[PDB]
């Protein structure tokens, strides 16, 4: 994970991961439903934002050019990281 | 029940838009009487009743300033679009958002009811004393109470907007990733909170002069103090009504050019500089009241500095269209028409800002032409640009493209041939708020009255544009309202979307 | 940025993409804006004809002929009459009015 | 909120100028001639004439030479 | 003196101040013509030359520091060039540098105007020293 | 026992018992600086109230007793005005 | 029941079509479904005509009212 | 076990505060609005 | 085989803007605008020239009556001179 | 109903910390109550019969709907619907409302400063006008200053205290010191040798002090409503902090009002 | 006969007065109805007071009106300065303002000391 | 007696200082024949003409004009009685509001003779359209020799 200092404890991290999504090793995005809107910035320009829709049971998907790949996973609970695992502090 | 007890921002925004359309119909109807009386020298359909003409222009100016443009831009598009755009699941105070709407039909009813009482409130939309004090009866009190209720509506809406922006943003989204529409609405809310209570104080002073025999603006008081307080409100008021139009033009221009906005931080600094300079130049409405020459000197030198940020915004819009892949539809034309015709209204403001030149054209139809350029080409074009752009997302109905271009061209022909001859009338010396003029002013008044009929016919054709919509599935977008279905669900953003920064 | 344009074009199928600046053909636009201008002219004419209660007597043709005989001349009660607007009608600075001119 | 772009300081120079002019204008008004709540202020004619002429001269004496030279336009129209 | 049919610009003037106001207005219109023409021409060219039938896919142009500084520093110079004559015209509205010759009190009522005057007319012998010498040579003989 | 406030409670920690009493003493010093003396003088003022009298009639200057409309919405005299002081005779 | 604090706080747990709606606006995919109101285009045109008639006829009534007061 | 009869927010008081007032006040405002409209329109000011 | 994000932009310089000529069009626009502005200022200078000639002619006329007034005054002085010498 | 809480947890509560409201009827009733009270106020200005009664009827309807709305807000605050971020949203909203009221007071004191500094020829250029006796600063207004500063410090006590008895006592002390401000203002209004129709001095004094006193009354009622919720559960949340902020705002407004009117003779 | 070498100063002054008057009555007239061609009319208005610099000139009116009655109280009724103040306020003040000020003076509602 | 008068004339012939003193006495006696100052005063109203003839302008024509000399510094004091009005003459570059209780001064000097028109430029009631302004400008010698003789009592 990234340093959790100066982060709100209820932000559901995975967005604070130390991993760049590749085709062979994507970032798994948890979801409470079969589809979920996320937002990816442009790696060469922070001011540019692209919103996309991930679907369950689909191949890895890239949103911006030279950006990460993402896979949705349907879960019952999403870890509200800031008190879920840094309280575990394993 | 649904439309009476609602707590959803999307129902409240649609109610604001329908209310603003009703107010626009009322002000269109009140404006055909103005142009039908002024078509020919002498006495027209008003039978020489000057008090009724003053009532008509007062009600028409107040309605079009406060019950059409603000409920369409600030209340209609802002409430529907802000939580979807920043990713908030709802507003910060959902029931305050319903009383921010429901104080507007009482204010409209009071204003329309003041016309049927006594001889009506013929004072102008500015309502200067001692003419407003001299009016005997009930009509002026109903008009000022209507303004009080509308100001309370605006203050409550601005509080809800400012708390919704600061505290319900999506995770990971800072004050760099919000669209320029959000920045415009936030700056408009700040202006409303800083400006409306000064008007409320001046109106309380007006009621105490009228009904309590107090000494605010009277024999022993000072009548220039009213103009100070009212225009300290009123010059922020005209920038309240044009900033959401700037936001809508930015969103429309960036969409069909297939490009992001040129100079985002410059755009935000320009909107902030416009918001800050609007509070120190109010006395350019008071060059002819007898102020000292140093005060007039300052208010002349500080008014023209507003040209620089607006020019930066216009040039950045042109740079956004520049080097893009442009597709011209009906909202794209209303934005191009905005940028072309707001520039014409802005340059006459620089002329009016110079005080020596303003001694010749004060209270003439030159001023009328200036502010109908910056309001019928600036705010009305911005409103109609958003109606065709977001309409299938908001209402669930599409629009016929050919009839919308017919409506755009009828409107564009009508309002240009209405207010462009009024420049020549105001330069020659035709004064404001008069229903009869000298014999030589007949030609341009006939031309302007011909143009107003084309504008009315354009208003008629707009009701025929609506048709059934086609629905598809979204995948990606650059803003959050275009990855949603048309129409969205009652709880749009069923899961809160987050913004992830790319890793190393 | 391209996919949202392609989504908007699918939800607005009556908007043409045929490769020209005015996507709606002008054979559709021109007769209908002409019909709108014709209806506006009908309304404007009806206002000019049937909705006037006082036409002033300075617009009658006898007044107009008698005024055209005088021209742009203003009388004075303490002085000889004077030409109105001496710059846009190019009266020379030696001549002040018609009676003081006394043509040679 | 962001990095102030090279434009924003060029904007901020006349904005600071307008704010300083506004503050100086509001400050000099309680040091003016007609802001006296007495009739006995005007019975000292030397001091009152000196104060009101000082209220005339400041911010106008910068313009006296070009008022006398009729520099009332950007161009020179005779 | 009076307005005219189909008139475009101002009326003719009888004071130097009104002429100076019209001169200032025409000086401002000098700049406004160039600004409006630049905007309209550049927008026509951008509309025609960047249609989607001419462009395969857009370019990524987000910022340009030189052009932004240029269109910020150019209108500021126009504003400060316009302002100094306008400020000079404002401070010229007081013209009390002569002996005043008349006072007229104008009162506005509903609905008419009222004009008042109360001055004093005094007579002075025009060039009395010639009459003084004429009396001197009348008395010397 | 499954409320939203309890559900999100561990994610919003309180910012960190005798320091509270120290702060109470610090603020109560300023409270007792101006507390008892103002209450004592106000309780004195409540007993020296409507007993004094003024008989200074005021001449009817044009800026006194403005009557642009006849009377007041409640009556003739001002609200809270037991004894008008402006001359109604004038002489 | 029916007036408890939970009814105030979480509303009434109604499911399905409300009273006369043909679509679920609260929990369905669209909060406005104008293609499912029966005879929608008649009602839309009647409502738009009523809105146009009132919005263009209120100032005419106020002109007729003020001028009938003088002509008496 | 956390509510008394003296408590303003008692659940037994919810019908009176929320259901009865919603119709009583709803008809009172209609009656007041009609009378106020007639009073301001067809009334004569004595001051 | 995943799903890839397509290329969406050209770099500024090799898209459809190399053939535009921004500075050429700016020079054309400035030349046209300055031509129209100098035409307007030319008309204004013409009108001011006529006004200056008008006021010069008026001063030429007004200098004529006031010389004949002083001439008549000197004639009355020459009459009053012989009135007190005869 | 039993599944409505389950539905809220499954769909709104467990996803984000923000509160979503069911439909409510009070904004519509409050708007039409403002309409009725405005018609009544217009009739009451021009001495129409049964006009003040209509204005009081409309104001009573507005006050009843506002109390019902605030009772619903307190009920929702006691079923634990408001997390910490919702409470910070409440504090930010009160800050915005306070800024609006401060600008209203700035507009009110603008008129006092303008009218007092340059007396017109209609007043024969003397300020304060002859016949007007100004209210001094070395008398009962100074007692009000001391009392209201003590109320400021006592409200500051209740913000930091953790003992419930000390909090309730400090709240009651601030409420009682506020009620002593108003009953002394009533005595100033009765003993003063000028009315609201006597000169712009009387006009500005009475209008400004009346608005300030009405804000003192509203802040005291807000602090009283905050105390009874703390009396029951020993937990107030945002009701205590927003009320203490509003009371501090009133205390800050009094400083400007006193310094301009009572000291500056404006 | 008293010649010029024996006359005093007062007799010589009277003789000078007789000599001047007996010819200027023929030149100008006994009343002065003959100088109408040698007379230049000029109109006198209120001078610019440096104490009153603003465009609103109500205070100049009021102060001149009050200086007139102060002059009337202090330096008699027929002093030239009092006439200067009277013509100064008459030149500036509207007639309605002045008549309102004498009715306030007659009713006793004038706040001036004099 | 009579020779002493002749001796006074001989001293006028001889002494230049006595000649100058008696010349000054002549100048003192001639100033005594100059008529004293007389006040000029008027108060008239100016109303719009309801019916005009050819050579007159509808709406803009009045019954009583304001007569002002040319090449003279004129102070215009503008005020009102009931509501706000504005005294606007577009040909002379003067437009200043008439405020009840204020006394707004204008310094004005007219270059050429003529008849200048105007209207009121502040909304003031039902008949705001029908308050026109006409200023007649004449030469200063005519103004000081003929027009001001109409207001000598
Ligand atoms: C928003 C501001 C606004 C708008 C749009 C207009 C629109 C028009 N106005 Fe006016 N006008 C004013 C603001 C406006 N006006 C003000 C402030 C005054 C001063 C009054 C006073 O002095 O007291 C005034 C007064 C005024 C005068 C001067 C009267 C006088 O001085 O005596 C004239 C003269 O011709 C005029 C005519 C027109 C005409 C022909 C239109 C036409 O454009 C007709 C309108 C046509 C439209 C197309 C606009 C309607 C918009 C919609 C219908 C959009 C809403 C739709 C949705 C929300 C879906 N109006
Ligand atoms: C939409 C509302 C709106 C907007 C945006 C504006 C914008 C401006 N306005 Fe105006 N105005 C009104 C609405 C508005 N106004 C109304 C309703 C009235 C009459 C009130 C009444 O009823 O009495 C009024 C009256 C009014 C007056 C009072 C004059 C009088 O009535 O006697 C003045 C004086 O300074 C003024 C000036 C300006 C200026 C300088 C701007 C500037 O913000 C505009 C700046 C924009 C540009 C200048 C063009 C873009 C810039 C460039 C392309 C760069 C190049 C420019 C230069 C180099 C100079 N307008
Ligand atoms: C009568 C009108 C009373 C309105 C009460 C009000 O404004 O309070 C709101 C909050 O207001 C503020 O934030 C402060 C502004 C107060 C405005 C008071 C109006 C005074 C008018 C004069 C309460 O928010 P809500 O009703 O949307 O419920 C929120 C819920 O409890 C949890 O989300
Ligand atoms: C919607 C906007 C609000 C519009 C309605 C405003 C109506 C104002 C009503 C004022 C009625 C009371 C006025 C009055 O004379 O009372 C004074 C109290 O001041 C006050 O309380 C004045 C402030 C009123 C704020 C409301 C003191 O009375 P007085 O001056 O006659 O007493 C002096 C004798 N000792
Ligand atoms: C001046 C009027 C100010 C009214 C301020 C109302 C704030 C509403 C609020 O914070 O709601 C959440 C708030 C919840 O706070 P909690 O106790 O932390 O849940 O709702 C309330 O019930 C606040 C208390 C309302 C008290 C009545 C207002 C009395 C004002 C004078 C009349
Ligand atoms: Cu403005
Ligand atoms: Mg005006």
């Amino acid at each position: 994970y990234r340093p959790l200092g100066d982060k709100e404890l209820w932000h559901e991290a995975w967005m604070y991961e130390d991993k760049f999504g590749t085709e062979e090793d994507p970032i798994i995005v948890p979801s409470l439903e079969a589809e979920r809107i996320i937002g990816v910035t442009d790696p060469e320009d922070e001011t540019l934002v692209v919103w996309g829709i991930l679907k369950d049971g689909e191949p890895p998907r890239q949103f911006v050019e030279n950006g990460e790949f993402y896979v949705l996973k349907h879960v019952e609970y999403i870890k509200k990281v800031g008190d879920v695992l840094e309280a575990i502090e394993g | 029940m649904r439309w009476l007890y609602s707590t959803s921002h999307k129902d409240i925004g649609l109610l604001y838009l329908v209310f603003a359309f009703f107010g626009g119909l009322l002000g269109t109807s009140l404006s055909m009487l103005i142009r039908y009386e002024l078509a020919l020298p002498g006495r027209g359909l008003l039978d020489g009743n000057g008090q009724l003409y003053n009532v008509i222009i007062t009600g028409h100016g107040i309605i079009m300033l406060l019950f059409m443009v603000m409920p369409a831009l600030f209340g209609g598009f802002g409430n529907w679009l802000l939580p979807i755009m920043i990713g908030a699941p709802d507003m910060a105070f959902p029931r305050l958002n319903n009383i921010s709407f429901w104080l507007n039909p009482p204010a409209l009813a009071l204003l329309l009811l003041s016309t049927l009482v006594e001889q009506g409130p013929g004072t102008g939309w500015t309502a200067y004393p001692p003419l407003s004090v001299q009016h005997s009866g009930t009509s002026v009190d109903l008009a000022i109470l209507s303004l009080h209720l509308n100001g309370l509506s605006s203050i409550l809406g601005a509080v809800n907007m400012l708390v919704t922006v600061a505290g319900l943003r999506a995770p990971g989204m800072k004050l760099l990733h919000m669209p320029l529409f959000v920045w415009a609405i936030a700056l408009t809310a700040v202006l409303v909170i800083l400006a409306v209570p000064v008007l409320a104080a001046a109106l309380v002073m007006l009621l105490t002069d009228r009904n309590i025999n107090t000494a605010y603006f009277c024999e022993s008081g000072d009548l220039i103090l009213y103009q100070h307080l009212f225009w300290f409100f009123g010059h922020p008021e005209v920038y309240i009504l044009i900033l959401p139009a700037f936001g809508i033009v930015s969103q429309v221009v960036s969409f069909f050019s297939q490009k992001p906005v040129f100079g985002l931080t410059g755009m935000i600094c320009a909107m902030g500089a416009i918001s800050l300079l609007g509070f120190i130049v109010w006395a350019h409405h008071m060059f002819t009241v007898g102020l000292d020459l140093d005060t007039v000197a300052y208010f002349t030198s500080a008014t023209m500095i507003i040209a620089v940020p607006t020019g930066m915004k216009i040039f950045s819009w042109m740079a956004t269209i520049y080097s893009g892949r442009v597709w011209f539809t009906t909202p794209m034309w209303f934005a191009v028409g905005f940028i072309c015709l707001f520039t014409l209204g802005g340059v006459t403001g620089v002329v009016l800002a110079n005080a020596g030149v303003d001694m010749l054209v004060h209270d003439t139809y030159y001023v009328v032409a200036h502010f109908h350029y910056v309001l019928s080409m600036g705010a009305v074009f911005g409103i109609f640009a958003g109606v065709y752009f977001w309409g299938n997302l908001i209402t669930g109905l599409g629009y016929h493209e050919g009839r919308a271009m017919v409506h755009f061209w009828l409107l564009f022909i009508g309002v240009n041939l209405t207010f462009f001859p009024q420049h020549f009338l105001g330069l020659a010396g035709m004064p404001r708020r008069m229903f009869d003029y000298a014999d030589c002013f007949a030609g341009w008044n006939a031309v302007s009255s011909f143009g107003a009929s084309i504008s009315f016919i354009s208003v008629i054709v707009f009701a025929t544009t609506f048709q059934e919509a086609v629905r598809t599935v979204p995948r990606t977008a650059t803003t959050l309202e275009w990855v949603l279905l048309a129409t969205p669900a009652h709880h749009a953003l069923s899961q809160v979307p987050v913004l992830r920064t790319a890793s190393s | 940025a391209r996919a949202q344009i392609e989504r908007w074009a699918a939800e607005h199928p009556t908007a043409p993409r045929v490769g020209r600046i005015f996507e709606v053909p002008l054979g559709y636009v021109v007769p209908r804006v002409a019909a709108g201008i014709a209806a506006a002219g009908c309304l404007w004419y009806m206002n000019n004809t049937f909705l006037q209660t006082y036409r002033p007597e300075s617009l009658s043709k006898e007044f107009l002929e008698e005024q055209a005989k005088i021209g742009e001349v203003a009388q004075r009660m303490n002085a000889p009459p004077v030409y109105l607007n001496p710059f846009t009608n190019r009266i020379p600075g030696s001549i002040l009015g018609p009676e003081d001119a006394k043509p040679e | 909120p962001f990095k102030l772009p090279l434009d924003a300081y060029i904007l901020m120079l006349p904005i600071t100028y307008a704010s300083a002019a506004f503050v100086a204008m509001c400050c000099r008004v309680p040091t003016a001639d007609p802001e006296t709540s007495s009739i006995a202020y005007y019975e000292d004619e030397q001091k009152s004439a000196a104060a009101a002429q000082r209220y005339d001269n400041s911010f106008k004496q910068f313009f006296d030479a070009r008022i006398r030279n009729h520099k009332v336009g950007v161009f020179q129209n005779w | 003196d009076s307005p005219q049919p189909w008139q475009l610009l101002f009326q003719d003037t009888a004071t130097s101040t009104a002429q100076a106001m019209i001169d200032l207005h025409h000086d401002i219109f000098f700049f406004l013509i160039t600004v409006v023409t630049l905007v309209f021409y550049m927008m026509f060219q951008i509309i025609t030359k960047f249609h989607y039938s001419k462009v395969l896919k857009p370019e990524k142009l987000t910022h340009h520091t030189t052009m932004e500084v240029i269109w910020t520093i150019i209108p500021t110079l126009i504003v400060v060039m316009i302002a100094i004559p306008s400020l000079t015209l404002i401070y010229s509205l007081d013209q009390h540098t002569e002996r005043p010759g008349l006072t007229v009190k104008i009162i506005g009522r509903q609905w008419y105007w009222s004009y008042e005057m109360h001055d004093h007319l005094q007579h002075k012998l025009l060039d009395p020293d010639r009459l003084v010498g004429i009396a001197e040579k009348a008395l010397v003989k | 026992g499954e409320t939203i406030d309890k559900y999100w409670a561990p994610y919003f920690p309180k910012p960190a018992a005798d320091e509270a009493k120290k702060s109470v003493n610090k603020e109560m010093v300023g409270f007792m600086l101006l507390g008892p003396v103002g209450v004592a003088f106000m309780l004195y003022d409540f007993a020296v109230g409507l007993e004094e009298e003024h008989h200074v009639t005021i001449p009817p200057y044009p800026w006194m007793r403005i009557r642009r409309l006849p009377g007041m919405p409640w009556g003739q005299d001002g609200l809270f005005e037991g004894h008008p002081r402006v001359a109604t005779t004038w002489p | 029941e029916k007036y408890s604090h939970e009814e105030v706080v979480y509303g009434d747990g109604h499911h399905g079509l409300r009273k006369g709606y043909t679509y679920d606006f609260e929990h369905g995919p669209h909060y406005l479904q104008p293609e499912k109101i029966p005879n929608f285009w008649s009602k839309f045109y009647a409502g738009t005509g009523a809105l146009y008639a009132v919005g263009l006829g209120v100032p005419l009534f106020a002109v007729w009212w003020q001028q009938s007061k003088l002509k008496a | 076990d956390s509510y008394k009869a003296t408590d303003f927010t008692n659940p037994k008081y919810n019908y009176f505060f929320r259901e009865l007032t919603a119709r009583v006040q709803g008809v009172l405002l209609t009656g007041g609005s009609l009378y106020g409209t007639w009073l301001v329109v067809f009334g004569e000011a004595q001051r | 085989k995943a799903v890839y994000a397509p290329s969406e932009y050209f770099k500024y310089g090799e898209g459809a803007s190399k053939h535009f000529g921004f500075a050429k069009h700016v020079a054309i626009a400035m030349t046209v605008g300055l031509g129209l502005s100098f035409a307007w200022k030319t008309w204004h200078w013409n009108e001011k020239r006529y006004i200056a000639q008008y006021y010069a002619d008026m001063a030429r006329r007004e200098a004529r009556e006031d010389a004949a007034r002083k001439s008549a005054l000197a004639d009355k002085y020459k009459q009053l001179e012989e009135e007190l010498l005869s | 109903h039993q599944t409505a809480k389950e539905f809220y947890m499954e769909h709104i509560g467990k996803r984000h910390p923000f509160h979503v409201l069911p439909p409510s009827p009070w904004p519509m009733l409050a708007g039409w109550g403002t309409y009725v009270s405005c018609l009544g106020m217009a009739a009451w200005f021009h001495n129409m019969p049964t006009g003040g009664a209509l204005m009081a009827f409309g104001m009573a309807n507005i006050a009843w709907t506002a109390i019902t709305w605030w009772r619903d807000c307190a009920i929702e605050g006691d079923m634990g619907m408001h997390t910490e971020v919702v409470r910070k949203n409440f504090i930010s909203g009160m800050w915005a409302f306070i800024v609006s009221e401060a600008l209203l007071f700035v507009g009110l004191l603008w008129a006092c400063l303008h009218l007092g500094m340059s007396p017109s020829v209609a007043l024969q250029m003397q300020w304060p006008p002859v016949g007007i006796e100004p209210i001094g600063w070395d008398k009962r207004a100074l007692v009000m200053s001391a009392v209201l500063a003590a109320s400021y410090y006592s409200a500051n006590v209740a913000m930091v205290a953790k003992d419930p008895k000390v909090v309730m006592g400090a709240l009651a002390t601030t409420i009682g010191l506020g009620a002593m401000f108003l009953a002394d203002q009533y005595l100033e209004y009765n003993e003063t040798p000028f009315t609201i129709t006597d000169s712009p001095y009387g006009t500005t004094f009475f209008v400004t002090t009346g608005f300030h006193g009405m804000h003192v009354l509203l802040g005291s009622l807000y602090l009283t409503a905050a105390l009874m919720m703390y009396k029951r559960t020993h937990n107030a949340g945002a009701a205590l902090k927003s009320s203490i902020l509003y009371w501090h705002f009133v205390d800050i407004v009094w400083i400007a009002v006193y310094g301009i009117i009572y000291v500056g003779q404006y | 006969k008293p010649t010029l070498e024996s006359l005093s100063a007062d007799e010589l002054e009277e003789l000078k007065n007789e000599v001047v008057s007996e010819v200027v009555d023929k030149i100008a007239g006994e009343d002065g109805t003959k100088l109408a061609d040698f007379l230049e009319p000029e109109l006198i208005t209120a001078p610019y007071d440096p104490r009153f610099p603003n465009r609103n000139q109500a205070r100049h009116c009021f102060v001149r009106f009050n200086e007139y009655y102060k002059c009337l109280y202090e330096r008699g009724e027929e002093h030239p300065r009092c006439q200067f103040y009277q013509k100064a306020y008459q030149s500036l003040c509207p007639s309605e303002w002045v008549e309102s000020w004498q009715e306030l003076r007659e009713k006793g509602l004038w706040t001036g000391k004099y | 007696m009579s020779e002493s008068k002749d001796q006074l004339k001989e001293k006028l012939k001889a002494d230049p200082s006595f000649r100058a003193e008696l010349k000054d006495r002549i100048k003192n006696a001639l100033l005594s024949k100059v008529p004293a100052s007389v006040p000029i005063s008027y108060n008239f109203d100016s109303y719009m003409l309801t019916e005009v003839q050819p050579g007159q302008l509808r709406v803009l024509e009045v019954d009583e004009r304001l007569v002002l000399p040319t090449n003279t510094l004129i102070r215009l004091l503008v005020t009102a009685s009931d509501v706000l009005h504005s005294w606007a003459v577009p040909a002379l570059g003067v437009k200043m509001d008439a405020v009840p209780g204020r006394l707004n001064q204008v310094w004005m000097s007219i270059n050429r003779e003529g008849v200048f028109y105007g209207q009121c430029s502040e909304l003031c009631g039902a008949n705001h359209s029908f308050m026109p302004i006409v200023v007649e400008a004449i030469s200063p010698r005519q103004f000081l020799t003929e027009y001001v003789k109409k207001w000598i009592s």
Side-chain angles (χ1 to χ4, degrees), chain J residues 112-119:
Chain J
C112 301
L113 288 184
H114 182 94
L115 290 178
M117 207 176 296
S118 198

Short mmCIF file of all heavy atoms in Angstrom, two decimals, chain J residues 112-119:
data_model
loop_
_atom_site.label_atom_id
_atom_site.label_comp_id
_atom_site.label_asym_id
_atom_site.label_seq_id
_atom_site.Cartn_x
_atom_site.Cartn_y
_atom_site.Cartn_z
N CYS J 112 -25.86 53.77 9.07
CA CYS J 112 -25.57 54.54 10.27
C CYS J 112 -24.34 55.41 10.09
O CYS J 112 -24.34 56.60 10.42
CB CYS J 112 -25.37 53.59 11.46
SG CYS J 112 -26.75 52.50 11.84
N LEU J 113 -23.27 54.82 9.53
CA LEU J 113 -22.05 55.57 9.26
C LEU J 113 -22.26 56.67 8.23
O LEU J 113 -21.70 57.76 8.37
CB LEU J 113 -20.95 54.61 8.79
CG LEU J 113 -20.33 53.67 9.83
CD1 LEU J 113 -19.20 52.87 9.23
CD2 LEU J 113 -19.83 54.48 10.99
N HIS J 114 -23.06 56.40 7.19
CA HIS J 114 -23.29 57.41 6.15
C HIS J 114 -24.12 58.57 6.68
O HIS J 114 -23.77 59.74 6.45
CB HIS J 114 -23.97 56.77 4.94
CG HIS J 114 -24.20 57.72 3.81
ND1 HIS J 114 -23.32 57.87 2.76
CD2 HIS J 114 -25.23 58.56 3.55
CE1 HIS J 114 -23.78 58.78 1.92
NE2 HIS J 114 -24.94 59.21 2.37
N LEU J 115 -25.20 58.28 7.39
CA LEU J 115 -26.09 59.33 7.87
C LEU J 115 -25.47 60.14 9.00
O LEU J 115 -25.70 61.34 9.09
CB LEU J 115 -27.41 58.72 8.32
CG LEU J 115 -28.30 58.18 7.20
CD1 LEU J 115 -29.56 57.56 7.76
CD2 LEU J 115 -28.63 59.28 6.22
N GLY J 116 -24.68 59.49 9.86
CA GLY J 116 -24.15 60.20 11.01
C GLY J 116 -23.00 61.12 10.71
O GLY J 116 -22.83 62.14 11.39
N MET J 117 -22.19 60.81 9.70
CA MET J 117 -20.96 61.56 9.49
C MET J 117 -21.17 62.87 8.76
O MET J 117 -20.42 63.83 9.00
CB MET J 117 -19.95 60.71 8.71
CG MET J 117 -18.50 61.09 9.00
SD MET J 117 -17.30 60.02 8.19
CE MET J 117 -17.65 58.45 8.97
N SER J 118 -22.15 62.96 7.86
CA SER J 118 -22.38 64.17 7.08
C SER J 118 -23.84 64.58 7.21
O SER J 118 -24.69 64.18 6.40
CB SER J 118 -22.00 63.95 5.62
OG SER J 118 -21.83 65.19 4.95
N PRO J 119 -24.17 65.37 8.24
CA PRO J 119 -25.55 65.83 8.40
C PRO J 119 -25.95 66.81 7.31
O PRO J 119 -25.20 67.72 6.95
CB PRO J 119 -25.54 66.51 9.77
CG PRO J 119 -24.12 66.92 9.96
CD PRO J 119 -23.32 65.81 9.35
#
